[PDB]
Design a binder for this molecule. Structure first.
Ligand SMILES: Nc1ncnc2c1ncn2[C@@H]1O[C@H](COP(=O)(O)OP(=O)(O)OP(=O)(O)O)[C@@H](O)[C@H]1O
Ligand SMILES: O=P(O)(O)O[C@@H]1[C@@H](O)[C@H](OP(=O)(O)O)C[C@@H](O)[C@H]1OP(=O)(O)O
Ligand SMILES: [Mn+2]
Ligand SMILES: [Mn+2]
Length: 276
């Protein structure tokens, strides 16, 4: 049905006046990206962007509500890429470190031996250090994606995936998500194959570093299944006609995100599940 229906039964999102739409707090990087994407090969792989609206003295993206076509949708959010922070965060952490006390807490909780003696003394870590740690205990570093959350239309949700890392651990999350619906799994795989094909020919994709975006998997008990790319808040244009392959390893300077390494692995796991 609608994401704000789920929000109410359970941020940056607000109910839209028009049926089938949702509002997201406007950010300049994401507005720029959605405008380019409506004219790109990837047009059909992202939510429709209808422009910006003002609601209580604040700018919102008018987006397609991806849940609108579905009867009580199941949603899985997959964060894509081997790297999940911009390179400029590394520069800022060196010259002008913003110590994050919150990120220290989240880290200790998962692994008490993870922080350094100095981080323990600071009770605080830099964003890049926190994000690099998150990448390594999840599947991000090795597979180039990670499961972030699952939501169901009753309000039922889980974000308990921070140590979901191995190929087989990831497969078991998708296995439980699709609940033996062969039609949903087949439609997901067909959609991911067509998405990969579109990304490989996209003018937008070859010219942009795609960081912190997700693949949103949506299905219902009527066996309807869709997948879309979302969240272009950290997607940045490459300088002066530079391009990425989105598969080669990230080395500070080269701006590689491993997006397609992730997608390749995600397709392989779903193809493996389908043969189980
Ligand atoms: N167009 C959409 N239609 C329906 N639901 C959406 C849409 N965009 C986002 N959502 C929902 O909102 C969640 C958060 O989306 P998104 O990542 O764009 O926002 P965010 O505020 O940057 O969140 P995060 O900090 O987790 O990255 C998604 O996982 C999904 O459940
Ligand atoms: O907004 P801050 O806290 O600076 O960063 C969050 C980070 O706290 C979060 O960690 P957890 O997912 O909570 O472990 C992962 C991302 O949502 C990240 O947001 P960006 O993707 O960088 O915009
Ligand atoms: Mn996001
Ligand atoms: Mn985000």
């Amino acid at each position: 049905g609608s994401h704000m229906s789920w929000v109410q039964l359970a941020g940056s999102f607000k109910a839209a006046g028009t049926s089938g739409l949702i509002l997201k707090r406007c950010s300049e990087p994401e507005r720029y990206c959605l405008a380019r994407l409506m004219a790109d090969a990837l047009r059909g792989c992202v939510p429709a962007f209808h422009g910006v609206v003002e609601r209580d003295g604040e700018s919102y993206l008018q987006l397609q509500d991806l849940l609108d076509g579905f009867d009580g949708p199941c949603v899985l959010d997959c964060k894509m890429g081997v790297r999940t922070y911009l390179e400029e965060e590394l520069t800022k952490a060196r010259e002008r470190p913003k110590l994050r006390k919150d990120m220290y807490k989240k880290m200790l909780a998962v692994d008490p031996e993870a922080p350094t003696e100095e981080e323990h003394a600071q009770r605080a870590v830099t964003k890049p250090r926190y994000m690099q740690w998150r990448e390594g205990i999840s599947s991000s570093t090795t597979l180039g994606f990670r499961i972030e959350g699952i939501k169901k239309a009753d309000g039922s949700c889980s974000t308990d995936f921070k140590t979901t890392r191995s190929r087989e651990q990831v497969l078991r999350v998708f296995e439980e998500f699709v609940q033996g619906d062969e039609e949903v799994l087949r439609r997901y795989l067909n959609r991911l194959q067509q998405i990969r094909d579109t990304l490989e020919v996209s003018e937008f994709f070859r010219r942009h570093e795609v960081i912190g975006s997700s693949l949103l998997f949506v299905h219902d008990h009527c066996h309807r299944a869709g997948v879309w790319l979302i969240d272009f808040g950290k997607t940045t244009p490459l300088p002066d006609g530079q391009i990425l392959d989105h598969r080669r390893p990230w080395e500070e300077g080269n701006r590689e995100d491993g997006y397609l390494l992730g997608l390749d692995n995600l397709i392989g796991i779903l193809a493996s599940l389908a043969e189980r």
